[PDB]
Structures are given as structure tokens and as C-alpha cells.
């Protein structure tokens, strides 16, 4: 028994040819109050993994602490902690999925939807979702909350199946993500103009971009709209 209090809306993500992209806005909502504005909802783990979290922010802060403990604990008595025995995205994911499912089974969930994005040591892209029920799935595109309803359809127009992924460049993928963040800001009442974005490339590594803004917004057409039916002036 519980209920989310301070919350953070969509996390959206996709695969491109050489890695993964993930983004989330910087807002912590308090019901319909847009209460906190500098909230990082992307969490780098090592330098091959970004965990994107939506839902309850207190539970998000708990999952942060767990992920940092995991890095510490992996480094213990491990001379290959920054090489062959570094934490892989799949390890980080399975761990969280275990936690999530155990917590729902005890009737005390972590009130979150989580996307783990990264690149494996064999160069393979990793993109997987887990939520408060312990439900897990993978897809060329993943999104939580509103993002599932609005971002996925736009992202899927780019990567509709597995074979579309060699064909998709960094530039096209980031372009699609950035556009989808704009659409979310247009239609999601709990979204923010400011967001963070992270690229995990098999060649580049980790690029973490903060303080990004939605630009090129269309508002001019508003002026022609008068009334709600018959009103002329």
C-alpha cells in the first residue's frame, strides 16, 4: 500500500546503429504543482549504462543509492573492475528487475518505470524496461508514461523492426528523440521544457548532455483561434 508523491514523467529511448539514446525531462511534479525544476532522472552507471527512471522520486533516490552501492561492491576484491569484470548493462538490469519483482511480491512496490540503456562489452546494444509490477520487455524503442503513447509512434516511424537499427545513424536517432521531447512538452501537462539526454555509443562511450531545451515551437497559429464555436471576434 502506497502512492507516488513527487513524480517524474516520461523516459524515452531508442537504438541506433552504434548504440542507444535515452532522454528524460528535469521536473519533479507534486500532483499538479510543477514543484522542482533541477531534477536529474538519468543515472549513469559506470560508463556503459544509463538508467532512466520515471514515477516516484523518493523511490528514484533509493534506486540511485542502490546503483552506487552496486558499483562500490563490484569493485571490491576485483582487479578487473574497470575492465573485463566491470558492470554490464544486463547485470544492472537483471538486478533491478529482481528488486522490482520482489518488492511487488511483498506488496510494497518501488513506484517506478525504469529503462536501462547501454552497450554490452561485445558491442551489442542493450535496451530494456522494468516497472513496479516486475514486468520486463525489450524493443527497438522504449518509453514510459505519456512517452509510450506519443513518443513510441514517432520513434517507431524510424526504427519499426530489428533490421531498421544498421540503417539508423546517431544524427537521425537524436533528431527523432529531440522532436519527440517537443511533442511531449506540447501535450503532457506534467512535462518540462528542460531535459537531459544521454548517448551511449560503442565508439564515441558516454555522452551526457544536461540543460537541453525544447526549441522551434509552433505557437503563431493560436492568434486565429477565437471562441469555442460561433464567436467571431
Amino acid at each position: 500500500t502506497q502512492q507516488p508523491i513527487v513524480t517524474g514523467t516520461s523516459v524515452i529511448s531508442m537504438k541506433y546503429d552504434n548504440g542507444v539514446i535515452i532522454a528524460a525531462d528535469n521536473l519533479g511534479s507534486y500532483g499538479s504543482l510543477l514543484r522542482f525544476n533541477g531534477v536529474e532522472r538519468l543515472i549513469p552507471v559506470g560508463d556503459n549504462t544509463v538508467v532512466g527512471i520515471s514515477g516516484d522520486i523518493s523511490d528514484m533516490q533509493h534506486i540511485e543509492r542502490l546503483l552506487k552501492d552496486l558499483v562500490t561492491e563490484n569493485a571490491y576484491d576485483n582487479p578487473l573492475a574497470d575492465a573485463e569484470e566491470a558492470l554490464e548493462p544486463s547485470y544492472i538490469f537483471e538486478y533491478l528487475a529482481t528488486v522490482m519483482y520482489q518488492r511487488r511480491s511483498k506488496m510494497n512496490p518501488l513506484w517506478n518505470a525504469i529503462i536501462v540503456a547501454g552497450v554490452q562489452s561485445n558491442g551489442d546494444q542493450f535496451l530494456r524496461y522494468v516497472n513496479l509490477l516486475g514486468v520486463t520487455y525489450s524493443s527497438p524503442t522504449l518509453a514510459t508514461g505519456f512517452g509510450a503513447h506519443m513518443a513510441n509512434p514517432l520513434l517507431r516511424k524510424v526504427v519499426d523492426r530489428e533490421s531498421d537499427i544498421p540503417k539508423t545513424t546517431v544524427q537521425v536517432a537524436e533528431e527523432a528523440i529531440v522532436n519527440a521531447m517537443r511533442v511531449l512538452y506540447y501535450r503532457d501537462a506534467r512535462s518540462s521544457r528542460n531535459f537531459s539526454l544521454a548517448i551511449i555509443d560503442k565508439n564515441t562511450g558516454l555522452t551526457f548532455k544536461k540543460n537541453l531545451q525544447v526549441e522551434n515551437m509552433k505557437w503563431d497559429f493560436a492568434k486565429d483561434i477565437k471562441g469555442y464555436g460561433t464567436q467571431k471576434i
Binding site: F146, H149, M150, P153, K218, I225, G227, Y228, G229, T230
Partner: protein, 222 residues
Amino acid sequence: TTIVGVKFNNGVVIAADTRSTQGPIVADKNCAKLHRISPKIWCAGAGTAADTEAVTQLIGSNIELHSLYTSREPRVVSALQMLKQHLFKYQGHIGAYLIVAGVDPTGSHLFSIHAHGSTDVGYYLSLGSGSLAAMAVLESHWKQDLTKEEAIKLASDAIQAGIWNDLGSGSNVDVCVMEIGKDAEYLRNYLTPNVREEKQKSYKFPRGTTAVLKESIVNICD
């Protein structure tokens, strides 16, 4: 259901998908969701399917009578006012959510109406379960001063986003184009990207497979 309305520079277009459902089951794989209110005022609905239909026919009926009485072409704002006052009086219990569009002597018009009786005016709109997938496409690609061709394409892409991504939507795309110039053009099954693949086998039975108890000829006339 996915329904859209898009205003272009010389008129308005509406489009809809063609799947109707009974819970999780597809009842009709190609039902027409675009209803006519009058020759140049067309209508797409979501919610209770019997309600959108009935409210469309009732107002369509009264609009015709109005037009005969006044010797004028029906106006879209009239359909709107009649629809909203009817729906409001029924306090939501008539679950009709409609995108109404048409041309009349005062120009081209695009409105949405909700079950409780509220209306909004727009340049582009969507309703139904696929509404969010449709809007994503509209908000990405709409612009002022679209041509007839660009508007048909945009509306169609938006219904498609619904067909693919929304489980309550599928099958085909129906379009209707209302231009200030000519007649309205109803474009049935404009797209058909969901043809059932050829079956692997025929299930035609050898005659006499079914056991019969007794038989008789049934009479019709008198």
C-alpha cells in the same frame, strides 16, 4: 478508434480507421466511421458507437428540415450548436465524442464535441483511443497553409499511427475531403494496408460431414 480533422487552406479533411471492437474482440474489420450530417458536413465519432450514430442521424435529420425551411445551405456552426445542446441536456450519458467538419457559405470549419457537451475549435484534432498516437504525428508535421494533397497525407499518416500503435484501432483508412470549391469527396477505404494473408489450407468440408436429425422445407408466402 482513431479519428482526425485537418484544416487546409481551401477546406477541411477528416479521416478514420475502420475497426470496431467488442471488448478485446474485433467485431467488424471494415466498418465506416465517417458519417454524413449533410452533403458537405461530415462527422467522425468515438465512444459508444450506437450514440455517435444516433446523434448524427437525429441532428442530420433536423439540419435537413432546417435547410428546407430556410432555403439556405446548412452551416457547420448549426450542427455544432444542435449537437452540443442535445448532448449537454443528457448530462454525458450519451457517450458521443465527435470531430465535425464541413464547408458552408461562410467557409470551412473544424470542431470537436465531447459527450458532456463541450466544444472546441481547431486547425487539427484527433479523438479516440489512438488519439495520442495521431496527435504525435499532427504536432510533428502540421503547418499553416497546407495544400489539399499535404492535408490528405497528414491525416492519413495520423490515422496510420493509430492503426499501428493503438490496439483499439486497425485495418483501413477512410478519408473525406471538403473543399470550399466543389462537392465533398468521400474517399471509402482510401488505404488498405492490412490484407489478411492467404490461408494455409481450405476448411471446406466433405458434404454429409454434419449429422442431421430431421429436415423440412420452410414456407414464406401465403
